[PDB]
Amino acid sequence: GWFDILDDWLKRDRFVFVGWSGILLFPCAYLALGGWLTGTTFVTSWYTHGLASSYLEGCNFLTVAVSTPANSMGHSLLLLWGPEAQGDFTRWCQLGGLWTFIALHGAFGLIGFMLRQFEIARLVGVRPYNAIAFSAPIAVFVSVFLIYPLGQSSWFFAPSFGVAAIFRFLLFFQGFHNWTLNPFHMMGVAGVLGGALLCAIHGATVENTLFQDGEGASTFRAFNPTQAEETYSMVTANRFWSQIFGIAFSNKRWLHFFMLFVPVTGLWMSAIGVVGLALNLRSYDFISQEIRAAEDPEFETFYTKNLLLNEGIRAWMAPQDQPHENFVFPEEVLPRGNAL
Amino acid sequence: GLPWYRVHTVLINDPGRLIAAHLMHTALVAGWAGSMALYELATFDPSDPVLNPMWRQGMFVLPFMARLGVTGSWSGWSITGETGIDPGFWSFEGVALAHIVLSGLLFLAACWHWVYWDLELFRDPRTGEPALDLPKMFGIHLFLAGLLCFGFGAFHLTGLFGPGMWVSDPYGLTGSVQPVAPEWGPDGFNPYNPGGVVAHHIAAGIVGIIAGLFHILVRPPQRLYKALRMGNIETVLSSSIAAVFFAAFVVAGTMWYGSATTPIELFGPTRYQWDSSYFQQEINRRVQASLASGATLEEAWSAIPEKLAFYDYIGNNPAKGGLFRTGPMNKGDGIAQAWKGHAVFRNKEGEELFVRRMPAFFESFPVILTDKNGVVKADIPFRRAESKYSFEQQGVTVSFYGGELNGQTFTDPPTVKSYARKAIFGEIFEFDTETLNSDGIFRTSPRGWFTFAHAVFALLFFFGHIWHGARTLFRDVFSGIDPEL
Amino acid sequence: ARRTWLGDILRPLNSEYGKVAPGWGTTPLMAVFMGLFLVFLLIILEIYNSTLILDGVNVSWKALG
Amino acid sequence: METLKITVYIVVTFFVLLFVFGFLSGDPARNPKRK
Amino acid sequence: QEPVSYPIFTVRWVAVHTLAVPTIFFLGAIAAMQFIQR
Amino acid sequence: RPFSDIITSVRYWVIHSITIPALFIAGWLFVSTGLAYDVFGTPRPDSYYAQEQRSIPLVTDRFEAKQQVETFLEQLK
Amino acid sequence: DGIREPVSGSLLYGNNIITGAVVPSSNAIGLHFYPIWEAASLDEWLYNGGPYQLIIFHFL
Amino acid sequence: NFMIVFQAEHNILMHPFHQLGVAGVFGGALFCAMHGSLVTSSLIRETTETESANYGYKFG
Amino acid sequence: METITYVFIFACIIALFFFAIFFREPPRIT
Amino acid sequence: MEPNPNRQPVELNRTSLYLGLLLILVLALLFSSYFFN
Amino acid sequence: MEVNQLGLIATALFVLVPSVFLIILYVQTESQQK
Amino acid sequence: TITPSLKGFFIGLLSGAVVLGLTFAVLIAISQIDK
Ligand code: CLA
Ligand code: CLA
Ligand code: CLA
Ligand code: CLA
Ligand code: CLA
Ligand code: CLA
Ligand SMILES: CC(C)=CCC/C(C)=C/CC/C(C)=C/CC/C(C)=C/CC/C(C)=C/CC/C(C)=C/CC/C(C)=C/CC/C(C)=C/CC/C(C)=C/CC1=CC(=O)C(C)=C(C)C1=O
Ligand SMILES: CCCCCCCCCCCCCCCCCC(=O)OC[C@H](CO[C@@H]1O[C@H](CO)[C@H](O)[C@H](O)[C@H]1O)OC(=O)CCCCCCCCCCCCCCCCC
Ligand SMILES: CCCCCCCCCCCCCCCCCC(=O)OC[C@H](CO[C@@H]1O[C@H](CO)[C@H](O)[C@H](O)[C@H]1O)OC(=O)CCCCCCCCCCCCCCCCC
Ligand SMILES: CC1=C(/C=C/C(C)=C/C=C/C(C)=C/C=C/C=C(C)/C=C/C=C(C)/C=C/C2=C(C)CCCC2(C)C)C(C)(C)CCC1
Ligand SMILES: CC1=C(/C=C/C(C)=C/C=C/C(C)=C/C=C/C=C(C)/C=C/C=C(C)/C=C/C2=C(C)CCCC2(C)C)C(C)(C)CCC1
Ligand SMILES: [Fe+3]
Structure with missing residues (x-):
């Protein structure tokens, strides 16, 4: 009646589509972006960590963030109307209400886009591989921004939206979990560099086996969008690659599926890796190495250097990185290379 | 096919x-x-x-x-x-x-x-x-x-x-x-x-x-x-x-x-009980309740259950351990035998000191002795000829209240350091590491x-x-x- | 196929594979179960995270009998 | 250890000479078109 | 393209106008911050 | 529909050259009268410390968090 | 580090795959060309991180 | 070990060029994934639903 | 004990390269 | 038994055999370091 | 130092049973026809 | 009794319901106008 009217007004063709997914996607995405943009502009983090992170306080674009809540909030969501600000907007901004605001509204914007991709694919009449492929960034998002702080004691250890605050996350993860020495991260890095490797090489091969159909040196003008005749010699690409490297694709369908497969799996394996850290289960040691370095003090490996360096990262970043513990270390118990 | x-x-x-x-x-x-x-x-x-x-x-x-x-x-x-x-x-x-x-x-x-x-x-x-x-x-x-x-x-x-x-x-x-x-x-x-x-x-x-x-x-x-x-x-x-x-x-x-x-x-x-000090607060509640009703320190601290003190130890915290450390928790630090008792560290002056206890995040934490205000009085210094607060210069002694070391005091510096560097883990226990060949790293x-x-x-x-x-x-x-x- | 005693007892339960109910039917009745169930999930989640501070309910370990 | 210097130099020299003589030897008509 | 039975303001209208007034308001405020002495 | 049709019609100018300077001035005056400092409660660069509290303000309870920060602002820090 | 602290990077002297490496040339050797025949013995050519230079020049 | 000493002595993360390098790798990986999905979702019907889709291409 | 397991796996991987290159299934145009 | 027309063979080929062996082998080499600990 | 002899068995089964699974799957379908 | 959290919670439920109702009413009205 009115339902099929609401249907065909939404599912209609326009300069940019909306659909049923539009109803969830657009408010959530727009609020999350808008929140980050006002947070980086006016909002302090001086009542939480003792930082300044906004243009109003005098910070540049490389040092701003919408910073996390305080440690004493636990895992509270900090709702505007709730009994931690009691209907008050100023305190709600100071206590970090914008971080959770942005995080939840962005979490629903991701589901909106995911659904939007499904809907447009069902409409156009193609297979939905692009929506299955898009579950890797949502896996990463909910493993790093949601599951990891929910395994810890607060939102305080989650990464803050900002570039330098993510850099501090990199150093924190390296320092306290030795994150590069965990095999799931090895697999994620490999998967991602292999995605990057396939990108350059596939482009370079297709663009350097093109047929003559133009008049000018540029061959960008020899293309019509129809698929009636082939646009690059696949046979030649195979013959080339089987001879310079040893193995080659001889199946386009499989080549493009390999391109889908490598980085999405990489990110999935890394998502399993960071949920493993949320319980503080962390690959940090090989027991055989400790017992050996215990019985022989003139044994050295690069791994032992890395653990001494991890000591340096932790002991020197802990004071201003965990102010809620009110840590005070004397200057004589800080670790030093020259004291060894 | x-x-x-x-x-x-x-x-x-x-x-x-x-x-x-x-x-x-x-x-x-x-x-x-x-x-x-x-x-x-x-x-x-x-x-x-x-x-x-x-x-x-x-x-x-x-x-x-x-x-x-x-x-x-x-x-x-x-x-x-x-x-x-x-x-x-x-x-x-x-x-x-x-x-x-x-x-x-x-x-x-x-x-x-x-x-x-x-x-x-x-x-x-x-x-x-x-x-x-x-x-x-x-x-x-x-x-x-x-x-x-x-x-x-x-x-x-x-x-x-x-x-x-x-x-x-x-x-x-x-x-x-x-x-x-x-x-x-x-x-x-x-x-x-x-x-x-x-x-x-x-x-x-x-x-x-x-x-x-x-x-x-x-x-x-x-x-x-x-x-x-x-x-x-x-x-x-x-x-x-x-x-x-x-x-x-x-x-x-x-x-x-x-x-x-x-x-x-x-x-x-x-872990939400270790970081909030759930068990340490009950232990304090009983021992202050025991001292106010009259008791001496020896009597009062021996009245604490072995169970309630056993939970007040970081080796029972599931946020310690690792992803490739295999087997029981006992394989990590031995089967407990008995409780050594509550340790109290004191300075030569006559003041009671308190050891800052380890967080879950760290894999090695400096050993610090503070007093009531929160200021450092002693520490075990990492640096090896530069010290001001070391136990030898401050004369630190350790006393035990409750358990099998009750009424004992130690006054020579190595033993005081030995107890203090494992006092950061919480309460002190005796463990047996020779029946599951434990190597002293948590599970x-x-x-x-x-x-x-x-x-x-x-x-x-x-x-x-x-x-x-x-x-x-x-x-x-x-x-x-x-x-x- | 093979006829058996037990199959004959259970036979009328899988024979209505075709049947639907005309128009939208009960769909408006479902929609409030959607619904108040989701509101209930909100309530019990917000009690557990202590964003509702009801009198007589104290979310703690110090509530065991 | 002195013999080792000389035989490594001879091997290296042999390969670099094949290389240069190979590129003087008629390389711009080794293409499959316009040979 | 945006509809041809033409509602008075279409969907493109809110899309450009939720991104028009904040950025004009913002680059006027960010510019004022530059002339704060600090 | 192309920007060429939008960049020319007089009604476009008769709205815009009137609305945009008001918004530009509304945005300017918002920071320059110091109102952004009160509505977001961000400190001015003479109000991060006080002469009786020389350490960082830190919240340590979550249901009196409100009262704790109002105390820090009431004593002129 | 040219002050007599060797580093083990070989599997046979008790490393696994993750910790193993070919350990760079010595700080004492510098930017010098250091083949087998500019050393007094193979023993001390290996002691100064000899194979490191030997892999990388050929590889590049 | 190399990365960690490199970061300490020069702070490579605040160098704008390293930031373009990670953008290129993240974007390269990203364009690979979406290119793969868009092409494999547009394939023609020469198959059935018991034999893989990849036997629609017969070589060259 | 540990070194043998490692080198056996590396040996299997290079033998696989040889077999995969010189005993492949021949791709042939139709 | 009684013939069922729904049953069908499985098809595995020489290239997929190589890919699978390579994946199991590089996985083996990566995780032995942690299993031995 | 230490080698763990249950870790040995762990890799041994990990690399055997799927290689054996794959080698049987590949051999029975190539041993049949056209 | 009605604790302060219960008043804030009821306000947030009603205001969230209102947002969703007005947006759905807005889409139906505009779609139904230009049939
Ligand atoms: C569709 C988009 C959408 C979505 C999904 C959300 C979702 C959310 N918002 Mg948001 N919001 C939106 C649009 C949206 N908002 C818009 C347009 C604005 C501007 C008005 C806001 C402004 C806003 C603010 C300022 C805040 C939120 C917050 C929140 C979160 C807290 C819970 C909440 O309010 O849920 C939304 C829905 C409900 C609470 C209830 C829906 C009830 C329905 C479906 C039926 C009710 C039936 C019945 C009457 C029950 C009777 C019971 C009785 C018999 C006992 C949550 C993720 C907060 C947040 O992120 O905090 C961290 C926050 O600070 N919202
Ligand atoms: C993260 C992305 C995601 C995606 C893309 C999908 C996609 C799909 N789901 Mg699915 N689902 C998800 C997450 C997701 N789901 C989660 C987390 C759950 C809960 C366990 C479910 C449970 C579920 C069931 C049980 C079923 C589906 C079904 C479906 C399919 C069709 C219906 C549909 O699109 O509903 C998508 C619906 C949503 C994403 C819900 C949107 C909710 C909104 C609009 C309001 C939220 C209330 C309020 C405003 C905010 C509260 C905030 C709170 C934190 C306080 C489709 C393949 C059906 C299916 O597979 O049919 C074949 C079916 O049986 N879904
Ligand atoms: C037939 C009788 C029967 C009985 C009485 C038991 C009894 C037991 N089994 Mg066993 N078991 C059985 C059959 C049985 N089993 C079968 C057939 C299997 C094969 C799958 C198993 C598999 C099995 C396993 C794997 C295990 C047990 C274990 C156990 C113990 C588990 C107690 C516990 O904490 O459960 C806890 C169970 C739950 C919390 C599950 C709740 C599931 C819910 C929430 C689903 C709701 C879905 C529903 C449709 C939604 C709508 C509901 C509606 C009302 C509104 C207990 C002695 C455990 C053990 O230690 O054994 C030694 C164990 O790990 N059993
Ligand atoms: C007066 C009657 C009565 C009573 C006393 C209870 C009592 C209870 N019910 Mg129950 N129930 C009843 C009737 C009743 N029920 C009826 C008639 C129904 C309808 C069939 C239900 C359906 C129901 C459900 C579905 C559930 C309960 C649960 C519970 C427990 C809630 C408190 C708790 O332990 O939360 C503990 C946990 C929570 C409050 C968490 C809820 C989280 C939700 C809503 C969202 C999760 C989002 C996401 C998937 C998480 C990961 C996100 C990731 C991105 C990080 C409690 C013991 C819950 C339970 O047993 O938990 C163990 C549960 O899931 N009840
Ligand atoms: C979850 C959200 C998230 C978001 C949105 C960003 C965003 C960004 N990160 Mg970060 N990052 C995150 C999480 C996030 N990060 C996490 C979890 C980690 C891992 C720990 C990192 C680690 C990280 C590092 C180490 C670095 C970045 C950098 C960057 C910038 C990269 C620019 C680029 O080309 O990227 C690649 C992406 C693309 C090529 C996509 C297209 C971008 C363009 C051309 C168009 C933009 C269009 C529009 C404005 C946005 C989309 C709208 C939509 C409706 C279509 C960018 C601002 C770098 C940085 O800060 O540089 C200053 C850098 O060094 N990221
Ligand atoms: C919960 C039960 C369940 C069931 C009944 C099925 C049923 C099915 N899945 Mg499936 N799936 C599931 C869960 C399930 N799935 C989960 C949780 C995921 C996410 C990981 C997937 C992802 C998935 C994909 C992506 C695909 C399937 C496919 C299939 C279908 C093809 C036949 C098949 O299983 O191949 C039999 C498969 C084999 C014999 C090979 C398996 C070799 C491995 C990996 C075995 C490892 C065993 C494991 C370690 C034991 C521990 C299990 C643990 C959970 C307790 C079939 C309908 C395929 C399909 O739909 O084809 C059209 C396809 O492409 N599944
Ligand atoms: C003593 C010794 C030697 C000891 C060994 C030391 C050592 C470090 C050993 C390594 C072992 C190690 C630690 C491994 C760790 C990581 C590991 C186990 C990773 C695998 C798990 C993983 C990440 C899984 C998920 C992601 C994934 C699948 C990643 C793989 C990434 C990867 C390298 C991809 C291959 C990239 C590649 C080079 C492709 C070339 C393809 C090719 C032939 C293209 C050419 C081509 C292009 C065209 O366009 C067309 C048209 C045609 C026709 C054509 O042909
Ligand atoms: C394990 C890796 C193997 C990889 C194998 C595959 C790739 C390599 C293929 C080639 C391998 C063989 C290369 C040739 C080796 C030559 C032997 C060799 O090193 O001998 C020279 C070696 C050098 O011996 C070195 O001596 C050093 C001190 O100078 C140290 O003691 C070293 O440890 C010792 O190795 O000596 C011997 O082998 C014993 C003495 C031999 C005396 C007869 C030599 C020939 C005499 C006539 C030619 C003299 C030339 C120099 C003088 C010129 C005129 C002034
Ligand atoms: C329940 C517990 C007990 C269970 C019983 C014991 C355990 C059983 C274990 C079974 C394990 C099975 C795993 C099989 C893997 C086979 C893989 C496979 O066949 O792929 C190839 C397969 C098959 O591919 C298809 O095969 C078909 C049938 O033959 C047709 O030929 C199709 O055209 C072809 O494309 O592809 C897929 O399955 C698609 C998903 C991708 C799978 C992985 C691709 C390979 C990627 C290589 C990455 C190498 C990384 C190198 C890293 C270097 C680092 C330095
Ligand atoms: C928070 C909040 C909210 C929301 C809000 C919003 C939504 C806002 C928005 C806002 C916005 C929305 C903003 C925007 C801004 C913008 C900007 C900031 C821009 C920038 C730009 C630039 C910077 C440029 C640059 C460039 C380019 C781009 C190109 C080339 C050239 C150049 C370089 C020049 C609400 C109310 C709901 C509630 C309460 C709270
Ligand atoms: C590897 C792994 C895994 C998995 C595993 C599994 C999956 C397993 C399974 C297993 C199983 C699943 C087992 C089984 C068992 C069983 C048994 C052992 C049996 C029993 C029974 C019997 C023996 C019976 C008999 C009989 C008969 C038949 C008749 C009558 C009489 C009688 C009763 C005698 C996981 C992931 C987790 C982790 C990691 C690793
Ligand atoms: Fe391509």
């Missing part, structure tokens, strides 16, 4: 064989359960429950049947700690062998159903090819579940025929199985209230009967039938999987933050393994969900598209 990742697709259109496969799978899950129980009963030490409980020995399936009230062993020892019992048939072994017999029954039927797959029952009485009437089945199965859920909550948890369930006190010193009683109050929604769990299985029980009846009586609207691709079995798969990782994420969370149904006596303390808790695994599986079952949802909604547009030519 079929590739290796679609080989189990000869059961999509054939019901008889599908039942057989499901039955055979259930027989494996049940056989594994029985066999795991037997395996853990071969590696449990029951003599010491105060300093060698189940959750320190890396027992995974043993607490789950102790949660509902099995406590007996035919050996005549219980996990509560009483000896010279008899439970009748139902011991740990009883359940353990019962699962073996059930596995066998299910395997025999699975063979039958694989062989006699063709029945008139699966054929349509109109078209004569295999169909299942899925809404009817949902109705019957919701009826079956609601009836059994109502039965479990009504007869088992109340102990009105059954045992009851395991309840404890806030500090997990005394824990038992008792009949519990329902609560329909608002407090029935507090997870730290047993009564609410009883009330649930009754209320949600009858709600399950009504809906189970409803779905058998009415027939689905045309609109939903066409919408969620009904009559295609593969959407039942997709919906059911969405429900599974809902449930998984909940049991990972309720286990990790703890609840009244994962007491701190069948899974050990949580994580069964609580922690549980929440790690179920989180991982939930994160994968989300992928499972969105893939099987796509297969049922793009069934007729797979195998490539008509290129409209």
